[PDB]
Ligand binder design. Structure first.
Ligand SMILES: *[C@@H]1O[C@H](CO)[C@@H](O[C@@H]2O[C@H](CO)[C@@H](O)[C@H](O)[C@H]2NC(C)=O)[C@H](O)[C@H]1NC(C)=O
Lengths: 127, 50, 99, 265
């Protein structure tokens, strides 16, 4: 009988030998959770125009928030945009006058929710 | 006026990466590396600071 | 009559993404398990494994191994625990003495 | 094989000015049109760097400390400088690092070498002489890589050793100045990181002799040491570091560092 025994030593030296990493597929233009080499977040990934230096991996803005990333599989730059959020307000006359209302979604495009696009947001229920 | 408002807002945004005596300033890392009984204490420290 | 801020709108994530670099320079297990000859019991052969990535799933799923046993680690969790180095000690014994 | 050379002309080493040399990228983050403040191990501005010669007869290869990191500059032509020896005892007692650049490839090896008292190489007028170590028993790490490499070339290196990681940053510059370090600004891009995990407190340099006794080619190198301090770095629109301010040099620099600007009203 042929016998092989494997022993694992984990010491104060940096870890060197261990298992592979399983990657998924890359999807753009949608609000997803993401993990790039241990950098985790939530947002929408889009095509970018920034050009990193060949040793650089991440991109930060003035307030030190990550806004660009490089795909480790294919060395391409992707921009990271927060998923939409805002306030929801109800425009009404008095209940003494009517029960009709209109709704304003603040800082949200009308395609992601009588639909009228203002700079204040998207207005539904008004002519 | 403009500069004072921008500076205050930047200070508020920057205060969000301090750990205030916890183990980490990232909620997701603490949640994924520790269990709720003690992640609760760490999260409470983060909440009081913020 | 007026306008009142009643609620908060928030878009929720759809999927989950994990990205990592290409798997290269795999550990050469075939140099040990498929060796043309082996060593004696008293003079067992030792080999060091480091500076590579090792995939135990292909080693585990093989049906050619009569005994695959250990106690302190569950074999399905050997693809993530990450160690300093690996020792491989090989020999040939009697069928009864495997225990 | 160990050979002792006894045709040296005794002379103390020189000293010279650093100017604004020795700035490297402190991480892998892209930044565009930003003034960023970083605290790290840097070479202070206008510091006194030691100058070693190799002229004919001078053959400078002493044992130097490593401290918390080393800045190494070489003003070079005709390729005399070759590599470095790192370790604590530089013998077989403990583990030592060897970086060599022979005529073919760059070899990094972490072994228990037995180093000669005067290790060197030799070039025949072709390389056929290599007397550095007598034995090397336990090798934990090996790495073959691509070649790194009036005076015409300036080679700048930064070596650090933190949490078992040996970091090497490098930069190459075409100059036309003869004796001293040129004055200017250039950032050193990261070159390699090795998870060797060994202690280093002393290091040697490796030169190549010329046989046509023996002759040492006209070469010169400079050594400086790193210290912990705060710098203000300027990233332009392509993400390159183009200027820095040492926040502890003089009062004007401290004012600039507090105001986060290169211009002060
Ligand atoms: C030892 O060699 C055998 C035969 O070459 C390997 O078994 C083969 O594995 C491949 C995997 O790609 C299969 O497609 C074949 O069907 C297998 N053949 C047989 C006869 O088993 C085995 O994987 C090798 N072991 C190691 C550790 O390298």
């Amino acid at each position: 009988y042929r016998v092989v025994v494997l022993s694992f030593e984990l010491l104060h030296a940096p870890a060197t030998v261990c298992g592979p990493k399983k990657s998924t597929n890359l999807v753009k233009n949608k609000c997803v959770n993401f993990n790039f080499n241990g950098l985790t977040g939530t947002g929408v990934l889009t095509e970018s125009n920034k050009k990193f230096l060949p040793f650089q991996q991440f991109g930060r803005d003035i307030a030190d928030t990550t806004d660009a990333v490089r795909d480790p599989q294919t060395l391409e730059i992707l921009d990271i945009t927060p998923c939409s959020f805002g306030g929801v307000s109800v425009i009404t006359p008095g209940t003494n006058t009517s029960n009709q209302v209109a709704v304003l979604y603040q800082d949200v495009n009308c395609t992601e929710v009588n639909v009228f696009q203002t700079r204040a947001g998207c207005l539904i229920g008004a002519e | 006026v403009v500069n004072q408002n921008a500076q205050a807002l930047n200070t508020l945004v920057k205060q969000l990466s301090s750990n205030f005596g916890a183990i980490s300033s990232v909620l997701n890392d603490i949640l994924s590396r520790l269990d709720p009984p003690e992640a609760e204490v760490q999260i409470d420290r983060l909440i009081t600071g913020r | 009559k007026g306008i009142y801020q009643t609620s908060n709108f928030r878009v929720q994530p759809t999927e989950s993404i994990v990205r990592f670099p290409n798997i290269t320079n795999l550990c050469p297990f075939g140099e040990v398990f498929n060796a043309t000859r082996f060593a004696s019991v008293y003079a067992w052969n030792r080999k060091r494994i480091s500076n590579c990535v090792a995939d135990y799933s292909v080693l585990y799923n093989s049906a050619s191994f009569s005994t695959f046993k250990c106690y302190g680690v569950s074999p399905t969790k050997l693809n993530d625990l990450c160690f300093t180095n690996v020792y491989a000690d090989s020999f040939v014994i009697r069928g009864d003495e495997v225990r | 094989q160990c050979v002792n050379l006894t045709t040296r002309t005794q002379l103390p080493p020189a000293y010279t000015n650093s100017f604004t040399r020795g700035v490297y990228y402190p991480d892998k983050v892209f930044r565009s049109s930003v003034l960023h403040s970083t605290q790290d191990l840097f070479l202070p501005f206008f510091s006194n760097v030691t100058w070693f010669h190799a002229i004919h007869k001078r053959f400078d290869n002493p044992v130097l400390p490593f401290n918390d990191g080393v800045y190494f500059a070489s003003t070079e032509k005709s390729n005399i400088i070759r590599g470095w020896i790192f370790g604590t005892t530089l013998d077989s007692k403990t583990q030592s690092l060897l970086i060599v650049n022979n005529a073919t490839n760059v070899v990094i090896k972490v072994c228990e070498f037995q180093f000669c008292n005067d290790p060197f190489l030799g070039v025949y007028y072709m390389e056929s002489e290599f007397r550095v170590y007598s034995s090397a028993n336990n090798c934990t790490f090996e790495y073959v890589s691509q070649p790194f490499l009036n005076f015409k070339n300036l080679r700048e290196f930064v070596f650090k050793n933190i949490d078992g990681y040996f970091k090497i940053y490098s930069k190459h510059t075409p100059i036309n100045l003869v004796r001293d370090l040129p004055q200017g600004f250039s950032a050193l891009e990261p070159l390699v990181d090795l998870p060797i995990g060994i202690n280093i407190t002393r290091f040697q340099t490796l030169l190549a002799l010329h046989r046509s006794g023996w002759t040492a080619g006209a070469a010169a190198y400079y050594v400086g040491y790193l210290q912990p301090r705060t710098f203000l770095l300027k990233y332009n629109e392509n993400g390159t570091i183009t200027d820095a301010v040492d926040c502890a040099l003089d009062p004007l620099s401290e004012t600039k560092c507090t105001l986060k600007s290169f211009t002060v009203e």
